[PDB]
Amino acid sequence: AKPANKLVIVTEKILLKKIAKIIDESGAKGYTVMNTGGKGSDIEANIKFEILTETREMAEEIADRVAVKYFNDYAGIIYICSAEVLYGHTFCGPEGCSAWS
């Protein structure tokens, strides 16, 4: 297994393409996005991005860049979880996630 940070961004849907561009420019290999309901009826339609990164640095760079650009003006939360990647051709490369020295 390969260590990873899982970065989660929950914010306004209008920001979808701008945030995707930031993730793309970061070096992260990819992302998952989903429609959510958010209360922060007063439920509103949000989006949630999930990004695995190999380093905590990469995750903080994405978080910092999203927040600095948008979070004065738009509601949002960004948080980080630990994770281990078991399989993932792009994340782990072709040697896979359980290579030996």
Add this chain to the structure above:
Amino acid sequence: AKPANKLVIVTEKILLKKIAKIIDESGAKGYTVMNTGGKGIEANIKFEILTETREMAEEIADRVAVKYFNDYAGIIYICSAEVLYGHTFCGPEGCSAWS
């Protein structure tokens, strides 16, 4: 970053408003909720709630489970998280960036 507990509730979709009322009364600052599927594949719902303490998370879990989960299907679990940004979660002071 600020430590958080992430409380997840997966349950029947008919309980959405009922469970949202409990979360709103708890003092948690917000929640996300999403439409999901479970083994029937039948439509259900998933809430995710960040709390500043484990006690707050447990109080929400206890109240939801006792009120509904002896009558409706539901599962409640908790994970650790660290919050980097969040005006409402961390407050106007921010998420303690040098901690």
Add this chain to the structure above:
Amino acid sequence: AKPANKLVIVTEKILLKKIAKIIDESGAKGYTVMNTGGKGDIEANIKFEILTETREMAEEIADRVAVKYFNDYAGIIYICSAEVLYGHTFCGPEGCS
């Protein structure tokens, strides 16, 4: 609370029923699945989340999904720690004590 392993699988939507079969055959008690998007334009994919009482059960699901599909279909599998607080099926009738 009961310690648990949270296994997540993100893969192509066409695989939904075939992955669900592997989860069901594993001994896992159930799963949540959702429609998601991935970098494409974004394109549609699916995400499963499965809680298991042991690590080896999670890995057995991961290994079986990757060996059958991941030479031919895109996919990522990862694992997180969790604790279950309430869950009649996961914890048994005594609860998650």
